[PDB]
Design a protein around this ligand. Sequence first.
Ligand code: ROL
Ligand code: ZN
Length: 105
Amino acid sequence: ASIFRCRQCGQTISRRDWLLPMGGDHEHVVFNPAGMIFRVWCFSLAQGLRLIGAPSGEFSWFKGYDWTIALCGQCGSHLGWHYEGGSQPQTFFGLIKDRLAEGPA
Ligand SMILES: COc1ccc([C@@H]2CNC(=O)C2)cc1OC1CCCC1
Ligand SMILES: [Zn+2]
């Protein structure tokens, strides 16, 4: 259980070692304006994604950060968001926990 793959296709995405304690915890439970709930895990780093469009501040769940949608690079599944434009760290990834599968390296 040290690495994370896309649950839908197996693409390698991130690692447990890359989890990022944001505001005290790597886990945040948040809602979008369409009322969908997400269990978001924060990572310092991820790979195998494809970032779509340019960043937006609108409805950002993390103060001072702008988001871009992050799809699985391989299958297109929506895995989370890349955050940028902030401070300490400047950037990070918020990934949806139930869209990842955890397993050996
Ligand atoms: C599942 O969709 C989405 C769900 C959630 C957000 C978040 C709101 N606050 C954040 O920190 C990002 C953006 C989305 O993408 C939208 C942009 C255009 C259509 C959908
Ligand atoms: Zn995938």
